[PDB]
Amino acid sequence: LDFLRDRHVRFFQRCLQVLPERYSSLETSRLTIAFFALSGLDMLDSLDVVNKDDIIEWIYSLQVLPTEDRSNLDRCGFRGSSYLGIPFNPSKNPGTAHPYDSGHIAMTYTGLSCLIILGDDLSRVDKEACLAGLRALQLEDGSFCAVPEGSENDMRFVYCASCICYMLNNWSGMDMKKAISYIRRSMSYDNGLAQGAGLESHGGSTFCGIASLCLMGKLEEVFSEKELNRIKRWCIMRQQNGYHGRPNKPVDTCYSFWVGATLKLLKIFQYTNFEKNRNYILSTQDRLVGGFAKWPDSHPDALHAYFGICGLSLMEESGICKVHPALNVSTRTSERLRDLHQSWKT
Amino acid sequence: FLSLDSPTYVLYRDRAEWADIDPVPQNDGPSPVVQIIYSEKFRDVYDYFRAVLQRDERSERAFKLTRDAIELNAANYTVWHFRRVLLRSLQKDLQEEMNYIIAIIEEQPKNYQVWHHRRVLVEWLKDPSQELEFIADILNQDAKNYHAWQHRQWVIQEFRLWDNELQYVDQLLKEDVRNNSVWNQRHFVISNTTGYSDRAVLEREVQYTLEMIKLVPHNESAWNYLKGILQDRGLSRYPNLLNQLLDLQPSHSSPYLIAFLVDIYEDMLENQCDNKEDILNKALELCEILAKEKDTIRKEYWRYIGRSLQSKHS
C-alpha cells in the first residue's frame, strides 16, 4: 500500500506528549523513547511540530554532572528519566550528590543523539565527565556495562559506547583495542555476530558490532575480505520478505533496519529485494493510529515506528530522509554533527 | 506481606511505620517529555522508594518496599540494585531470594534485570545446582529465548557443567531440528570440550548433521553448522563431501545445498585446483540456478556473487 506519513508524524507527536500507565516499564528508558520520536520526526522532516527549546532543557535536566568535589566522575553521563526524584536542573548548577544517581550508557547515547537532532551544540555537556563515566563502564574483555553500579554486559552497550565516542568526537572514552577484540570474538561459526563469544549470532548484535567498527573506521582492518564475505552472506540470508533476527525465526519490522543497515554498511543492501521488504514493513503499518508494529495486525510502538521508518529510509522512501546506517540519525543530522566537530577544532 | 491488590492494602502515606519519612516526588520540569501517567498507588509506592533510596536507608521496611516497587515495574534496574544492597546489609536468606526471582522470571522471561539479578545470586551462592533445570523450564515456554540460552551458557561455563549438555542438545534437536539456538548450543558444548580437531569427532558431527539434513533438507541451521565446522579447515579438502552432496541434489535439494556447493567450488578456485576454468563454470552455473530459480529473493546477490567469481578467476 502507501506510506501514511502524516499519520506517523502525529503518532510521534503523541509519544512526546503523554503515555498510558501501561508504559510504566519504560520509565527508566524514557530518553530512548524520546529519541525514537524525535529522530523519527527528524527522519520525516517534521521537527517543526515540537518546541526544540523545551525538549532540550528537559534533556539537559537528565545529565549527571560532576559534583563540587568531582568525586562522582565515574558516574557521569545521562539518566533515562527523572525517576530518582532529583530536583529539575537543566545542567545549570553543579551536581547534587545522591547515593544512587548515575548515568546509563544507553541514555548518554540517546541523550547526546537527541541534543544533536534538536540542533543543540553540546556546549552544556561535560564532555570529559561523560568520557570518564564511559571508561568506567568497560570490562576486561572489552565490552561494557550500562551503569557503574553493575549490570549485564554485551554488544548492545559496545555500540552505545562507540556512538558516544563518535559524537563527542573523542575515543578516549574506551580502550578501542579491547572493544575490537570483543567484537571479533563474538563472531559465530555461522559467521554472524552474537551478543558475546559463544552465543547465537543475532541480527541485533551483528548490527551493533559492524556499526561500531564502522564508527571507529576499522571495519576493513578488523575483518578480512574472506571474513566480510561470510558476514555479508549471513546477513543477506536474513531476508525472507521482511527480515528476521536469527535463522528460522519469524520476520520482525525492526530488523529491516538492524540487518538492512548492516547490509548497507557492507555495501550490498543494494542486492536485496526492495519490494518484498517494503511490502512487509507497510503490512505492519497501523493505518488508524499510525506507527508500525513488529508484525502485521499487531499494536504499534515507538521502537517499531522508528525502525520501520528507518527501514523504509534505507530504500529511499518518497518522503523520508536518508538515515545514516551506522550512527542511527538522519544523514542531515550526521552532517550537522560534522560541522559541529569542525567548529570545536579551532 | 501486604499485597498491592489486597482489599486491605494501605497507601504508604497512610502507614504508621512510614510516618517519619517524607515522600520524594518525581518532577520533569515545566514541559515534561514522554511523560507516563501514574495511578495513586503507583506514585505512592515510588514516592516512598525515592525517599528511602535518597537516604540510602538499609532498613527492613525498605527491603519490603522494593518488593512492591518491583511488582509495579520489574524493569527498574535501580530498584533491583538497591534490593541487592539490602540483601547484603540485612544479610537476608539468599536461598529464599532464589525462590523469589525464580517466580519473577517465569512471569517476565524477557526482562533483562531479572536475569541479571539471578546471575548475581548464583555467583554469591556459588551454587549452580538448580540452574540447568530452571532454564530448561523457561526454555519450555520459548525454546529460543535469548536470555535463557545466555544464562545457560554462563552457568555451564562458570561451573564447568558440560557432562550432560550434549545430550540435552540431542534431545531438543529432536523436538525441533530447526531451532537455531540449539544448533549453536551444540557447537558451544563440543568446541568447549573435545573440540573439532579430533577427526573422530569431526566425522561424528558431519555425519550427525547430514542425517538431520536428510530428515529436513530445508533447514539453514543444520547447513550452517555443517559448513561452520568445516569452512576453516578448507571445504575443498574433503573430496567425499562434494560427491555426497551432489548425490543429495536430486532428492534433498534446497538453496542451502546449492549454496554449499558454490562455496566448495570457490574454495577449490581459491586453492589453485585442477580445471580452474572448468570449476568456475560449475560455480557460475549454480549461482545462476540460485538467482533464476532456487533462491530468487536473493537474485541480485547471487548474480553479484557470480560476477565476483568471474572477475577473480579468469
Binding site: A106, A146, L303, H304 | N111, Y112
Partner: peptide, 5 residues
C-alpha cells in the same frame, strides 16, 4: 514487543 533494555 521488543524489549531491548
Amino acid at each position: 514487543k521488543c524489549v531491548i533494555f
